[PDB]
Amino acid sequence: GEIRVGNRYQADITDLLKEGEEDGRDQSRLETQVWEAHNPLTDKQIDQFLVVARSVGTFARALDSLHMSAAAASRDITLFHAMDTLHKNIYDISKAISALVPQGGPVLCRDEMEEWSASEANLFEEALEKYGKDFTDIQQDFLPWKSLTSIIEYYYMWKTTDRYVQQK
Amino acid sequence: GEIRVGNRYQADITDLLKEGEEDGRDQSRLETQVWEAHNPLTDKQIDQFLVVARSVGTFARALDSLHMSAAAASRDITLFHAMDTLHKNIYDISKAISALVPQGGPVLCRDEMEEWSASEANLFEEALEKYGKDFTDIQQDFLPWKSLTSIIEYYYMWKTTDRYVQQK
Amino acid sequence: GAXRH
Amino acid sequence: GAXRH
């Protein structure tokens, strides 16, 4: 509980650039844009596109439970993918819709929740109830073919499960 | 088995119009166009739109069986409606898609096959097996609230029914 | 008839 | 510790 002074504590203060000097920072190495906020589109059209992105998704998973598939297709991953599809296609609705149905065939986005097999899901509920929330061991011993970070993403999504009732 | 001659048999032959005379025929009273064949759109885009029109339809009937709803949404009525939606919106994909999702809500097209209630369908199979193909009496006595021409449209669609096996 | 009803 | 693990 003490604040220290010295070369090994304080930061070297970065000098203000001259009016002629330039910071020399490559912005593409630092960021890559995912949604412009000033679009030729209106809320209605974006909203509409989101409905469409959802419909494709449901029709996609109909081609290899109705309400279930629709809810599945209404999850955030599909929406996020819908907002990128717009931006990648320069907010051209007509161009962006092609992206969603590339060659007459729809696209499927499934989060780790939906994507895991019945038996993987099963494995997870055994590994949790047995190792609690120790997710490296849960993989090592129960789901070693999955990547840790996919098991995390799954965990949190699974915590909202319906059949999941730890509370009373 | 005889061909007749006289004023009461032959047609009065319509004289060729003068180079100055005009036929005087209002074309809007005679026809109303439903699809232009020279569109700014390509086969791919129309095809794509048709997939989209189908997806909406499936997602529509998900909001009050997956494969069943998709097939339902893939029937011709939905497609025809998709080709009109295009033409009404001047072959603007982006405008036409709004038409399909007017206010964030999708549109449902159901032919008489899909539209009839379980109990109406039932009535029909009793009326047929009892009155054969006498569709005015089938209505009068069995489905009097339906219009004859809807019962016809239903009939033909029903003849392809799966559970329908008159053949062996 | 006419043809064959 | 640091805070409360």
Add this chain to the structure above:
Amino acid sequence: RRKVCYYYDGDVGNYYYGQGHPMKPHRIRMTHNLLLNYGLYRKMEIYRPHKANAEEMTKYHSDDYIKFLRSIRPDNMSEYSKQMQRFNVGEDCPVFDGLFEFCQLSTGGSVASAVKLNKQQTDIAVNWAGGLHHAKKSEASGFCYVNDIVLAILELLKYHQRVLYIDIDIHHGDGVEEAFYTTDRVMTVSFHKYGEYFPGTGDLRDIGAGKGKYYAVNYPLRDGIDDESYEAIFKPVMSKVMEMFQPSAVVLQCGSDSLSGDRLGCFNLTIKGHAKCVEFVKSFNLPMLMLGGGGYTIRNVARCWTYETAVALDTEIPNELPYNDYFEYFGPDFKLHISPSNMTNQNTNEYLEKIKQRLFENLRMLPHA
């Protein structure tokens, strides 16, 4: 490549002639639907025909025959029976709910298209509902109530000096013949069964009358005609016809009861052969107006006119039928084409060449240089 206009009203498949009756309007809806799924719909100009009013139906028919049709119903069926007999409405031409609506659509399609041809804003125009060629001025006959063909032709005469009418239907096109029997401006050529068959008219010696003499061509035929025999007698005759009658607008009635395995017909033609005629006509690059007509094995009627529509668009379609609402109608095979039957062709080469020659003489009587 020629521009095509297609006329269709969704209601037309739903009108019904009556229990046990062979004419089934639903076959047009079946075609319509195949056209959409074969991707052909896409490629042509699609028009809904407004209803033709008594105004233009009386341009040929009786003011009181149409009046009768506008009025008659199954309600007042026992009240009218007087007029029913005078007008032929019964045994094989039933009364039925919507009848007049049906006529208006069939006639509207043909007339609208004729205009379209006269207005020079199409090359080909197609109305499968139309083609109802047995109708007469003051009476119904052979399932036909209004002769849309005549009315269509009457509009074309407004811009065309000579209108050729070709009729493939197995039944002799006596309505269109009788209506133009005394004129030289319209030539009616017809290939049909003859001898113990309807309508009893159109033998070798049926040549016309007055100014219309040597302008009604007929080819009488016995049972079992091949594509090969038919082709070998259609092309020669039609090339002469064009040669002599030199028309400026063609109206081809594409009756599909001349196909093999028809319910009423007894010819042995395949869709391929049948269509070869449409293709041959089209080749003469004249404003063309394709109508349908008879056809009573509707699965094949559907196939035929679907195929023949492709021919007007000179696009290829696969034998694989595309899925559609009525897909299950098409046998175990689900193919577009039909093959001919073992049925015996009683049209010997000797019999066809006798007739051919007689017709070539008749056609030579026309003026030429």
Add this chain to the structure above:
Amino acid sequence: RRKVCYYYDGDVGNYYYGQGHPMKPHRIRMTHNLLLNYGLYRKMEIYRPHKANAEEMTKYHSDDYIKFLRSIRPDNMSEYSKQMQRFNVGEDCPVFDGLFEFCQLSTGGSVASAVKLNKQQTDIAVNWAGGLHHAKKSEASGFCYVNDIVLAILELLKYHQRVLYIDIDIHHGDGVEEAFYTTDRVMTVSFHKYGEYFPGTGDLRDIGAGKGKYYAVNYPLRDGIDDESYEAIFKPVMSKVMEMFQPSAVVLQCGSDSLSGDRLGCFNLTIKGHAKCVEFVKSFNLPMLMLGGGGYTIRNVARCWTYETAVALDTEIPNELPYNDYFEYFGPDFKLHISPSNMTNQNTNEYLEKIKQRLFENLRMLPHA
């Protein structure tokens, strides 16, 4: 209305600190997702931050502290234990798989945004991953490994003479303080619990040193502070701060463990009160860089920063939480706001005014006219 830039990398929610550990990065993903469903995402410029490399992390940190972090894993955990103790990595700062990846994203977000502010192509920039304010030059501390804040500030100094740093987090922002303890160009103001609490630093008498004396403001506090008490001591002090220190870029650390019902915190603030600070700051219309920080009842962390994002867009959002993947996380209520608890506010008016006055004196020591 101010333009906002939001930085987020999808991976950040998936990195995990360890079983039984309170810091849970997943809370940022929860926020992200609410923002999308509240329709706010739509309204701001969304950037994925590339990974910050050791190059720019060593612009403040040890060449061999970062080296250590780049290298360490749970594999070679027993091999390094020597260096582990020298760098504070253990009891409450675990090693965990992806740790260095996590730091790169948190730091990348803050740096990229700083640039964005310097390049004058935003007014506000938001990075909820960032804000990790306990980190030191040569050691990790209080769940913080890299001090993204310092690095961010160091970039801003390239264009801004005076950078103000405000810290709402319940824990004293000693990392950002110590790093700038001897400079007059950056003023570090912090409101926090004090007395048997981490990090043990930041009492009334912590004023700075050298050139940095009278430039480190602190407000020590006991348990149970209201929105009302907090507001009544934040606005006065910050208006003086602006008055005196006259900054040209603000960096507001929006620590959410100062909210009521936090797992580690013991303050009684509501989202509303907490946000009133962000709104007050924003009002001073300076280039602003919102970061997150602490927060350990993640349901509320989510709520807070979602709300506070709206504040930067000055758009209204309903108390009704929108459906989302984690909707079921939010109690029986599914509302955005929280209300304060019956918990007793041990910050009597007398105690707050004593401190306030002492600070007003400290601030008066700065130059002005």
